Amino acid sequence: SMSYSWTGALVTPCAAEEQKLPINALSNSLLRHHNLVYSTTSRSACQRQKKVTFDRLQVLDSHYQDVLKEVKAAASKVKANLLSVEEACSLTPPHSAKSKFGYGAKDVRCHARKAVAHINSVWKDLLEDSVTPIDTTIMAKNEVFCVQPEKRKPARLIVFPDLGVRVCEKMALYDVVSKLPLAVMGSSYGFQYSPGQRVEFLVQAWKSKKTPMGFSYDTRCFDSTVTESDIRTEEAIYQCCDLDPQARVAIKSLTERLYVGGPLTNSRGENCGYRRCRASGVLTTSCGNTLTCYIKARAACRAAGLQDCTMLVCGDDLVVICESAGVQEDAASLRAFTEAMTRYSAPPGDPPQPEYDLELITSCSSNVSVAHDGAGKRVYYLTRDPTTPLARAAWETARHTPVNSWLGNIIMFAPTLWARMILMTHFFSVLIARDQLEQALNCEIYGACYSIEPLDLPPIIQRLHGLSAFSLHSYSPGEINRVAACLRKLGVPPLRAWRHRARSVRARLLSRGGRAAICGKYLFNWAVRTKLKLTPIAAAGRLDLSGWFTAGYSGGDIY
Ligand SMILES: O=C(NC1CC1)c1ccc(N2CCN(S(=O)(=O)c3ccc(OC(F)(F)F)cc3)[C@@H](C(=O)NCc3ccc(OC(F)(F)F)cc3)C2)nn1
């Protein structure tokens, strides 16, 4: 079956969409080459629709069936609870698409009477009807990128049910999604890790092999490759859990009326077509993709005969580290792995490449790199090309955005040369200029939403990355060059200009005392020759990373 069928109605916007990077003096101080920066809009939705629409080939073999049996046996050990309306209401991210039934995300989060009454009626309908297709809205996602030399990218398409339904999905399945992937894949479940644990996992996996070979596997439009039978098997896996009788019913209804497919409506209420694949904006998107990718990859590793595989899976992101059998055999065994994945309806985007250096693997848009701490000890950390984070940071300084990628990037990429010298310096000077140091901000990290005050960044970074995050130096030539080439391309000031700017930022923060002085001391110790002694921050031990800062969860894409 075709992943999509279209009517000719266009994917339409809700409000005006700006494609060009807006400019103000502060955003320009970060990046001057504004013409290279763009936002994706509904104008390119037609281009994305052609890429994501294809027929699926699915031939399951004994290797696939063997892994599915292990997953179902592992799933039987899970006990998951039905969430109450209130609980599901509190997990709703701020700014998620309002309901067409007269209430929005704010009403849901406040447990407003009107929102709760509607959600309750949606839930009763899921218990009484297991068949009628649920309507979905299709929107073109607005995301910021820098133009590429070889290739603007078309907008990604987001398919989501109404807000009331989204809350019901958490009531029936939030507890399943929070427990099932870890129970099923153990150490291979990538979402349990911080950046420091992911790097430790990859380095340890690499060192455990006699002659390691690794690869990232890029599935072409993963969501579209997900078949009706893949979605029905995810439901069969969910049912292996010890569940409440009402959750079992709602899970079946959600699968048959929404997850497997259904009608697509644009923002103007016109019929856009029909979906027979993964919806990008459902609670089970991330969990379902993680499970389905793990099943197909584990079976494909066996079908290819790859020796001693260690896998790390994050949604559709897959990385495999195995025991090399020589370059000719590895290239042939990777083609056999690809052929098996293709047969399982997971064909490649870019064909995988065997890598013999851990640093040359890109996975979760990142790579392993090395630096040294204050004692000169070797430290492995995760980094990436800063182009996209910098372009988005410039947009976010010119325009107030509900969700700030800059904050999530400073958090996830805190040990990096670029996040420290550029992102930290820039945002703390902008927060000083605007008097917003104490204002809590929203950010999203792979669907997990957080509400964080910039003044809490130092204890957050210490708890997440460790004290070494404030003392890394002696970055690699490749890393330095990648950042430096990025600055020249984007019109971003050189690192030495950022160092001088940071010394002024640092002084202003120190003079404010309290939490601001801690920001100046810890985050900007790299900017001074005469180093301050960085002792554990007391607030780092008091906090709880996972629970104190949570603003909810979106199982799939934005809105
Ligand atoms: O969809 C999910 N589950 C469904 C499928 C079943 C889901 C999604 C996210 C998520 N989390 C918690 C763990 N962490 S976390 O980093 O420990 C962290 C914890 C607290 C915190 O709090 C703050 F914000 F307050 F600091 C901030 C961060 C984040 C993460 O995505 N990790 C993986 C990862 C790690 C490194 C990577 O690589 C590179 F580093 F390059 F990005 C890429 C991915 C966010 N948990 N679950």
Separation of 282 CA from ligand 1 center, angstroms?
18
495 and 535 within one domain = yes
The amino acid that residue 88 corresponds to is A
Ligand 1: atom nearest CA of 289 is: 5
Resolution attained, angstroms = 2.1
Decide if 183 contacts 78 (C-beta within 8 A): yes
139 and 250 within one domain = no
Closest CA to 522 of 535, 513, 508: 535
Residue 265's contacts (CB-CB under 8 Å, 6 or more residues apart) are 135, 136, 137, 138, 271, 272
Separation of 490 CA from ligand 1 center, angstroms?
28
Please tell me the residue having the least CA distance from ligand 1 atom 41. 366
445 and 558 within one domain = yes
Q: Which residues line ligand 1 (CB under 6 A)?
A: 177, 181, 190-191, 193-195, 198, 286-287, 290, 314, 364, 366, 382, 411-412, 445-448, 450, 452, 460, 464, 545-546, 549
445 and 410 within one domain = yes
350 and 270 within one domain = no
Last residue of a domain, one of 364, 394, 418: 364
533 and 397 within one domain = yes
The amino acid that residue 131 corresponds to is V
β-pairing, 317-323 with 212-217? antiparallel
416 and 394 within one domain = yes
168 and 60 within one domain = yes
318 and 341 within one domain = yes
Which domain does 146 fall in, by range? Answer: 1-55+133-161+261-276
The one-character DSSP state at 255 is I
- Structural domain count of the chain: 4
- Following DSSP, what letter does each residue of 17-41 receive, concatenated? ---B----HHHHHH---GGGEEE--
φ/ψ of residue 150, rounded to 5: -100, 90
The domain spanning residue 289 has which CATH number? 3.30.70.270
Decide if 4 contacts 271 (C-beta within 8 A): no
Separation of 169 CA from ligand 1 center, angstroms?
21
Closest CA to 522 of 474, 462, 463: 462
Residue 344's contacts (CB-CB under 8 Å, 6 or more residues apart) are 58, 59, 60, 64, 296, 299, 300
Last residue of a domain, one of 364, 394, 421: 364
Decide if 187 contacts 202 (C-beta within 8 A): no
Please tell me the residue having the least CA distance from ligand 1 atom 6. 287
Last residue of a domain, one of 276, 305, 334: 276
Ligand 1: atom nearest CA of 456 is: 25
φ/ψ of residue 101, rounded to 5: -100, 30
Separation of 91 CA from ligand 1 center, angstroms?
16
Q: In whole angstroms, what is the distance from residue 60 CA to residue 341 CA?
A: 10
128 and 68 within one domain = yes
Ligand 1: atom nearest CA of 555 is: 1
28 and 77 within one domain = no
299 and 420 within one domain = no
Ligand 1 pocket test, candidate residues 179, 412, 453, most atoms within 8 A of CB = 412
Separation of 195 CA from ligand 1 center, angstroms?
8
Please tell me the residue having the least CA distance from ligand 1 atom 40. 195
Separation of 390 CA from ligand 1 center, angstroms?
20
φ/ψ of residue 227, rounded to 5: -90, 170
Q: In whole angstroms, what is the distance from residue 222 CA to residue 350 CA?
A: 13
Please tell me the residue having the least CA distance from ligand 1 atom 4. 287
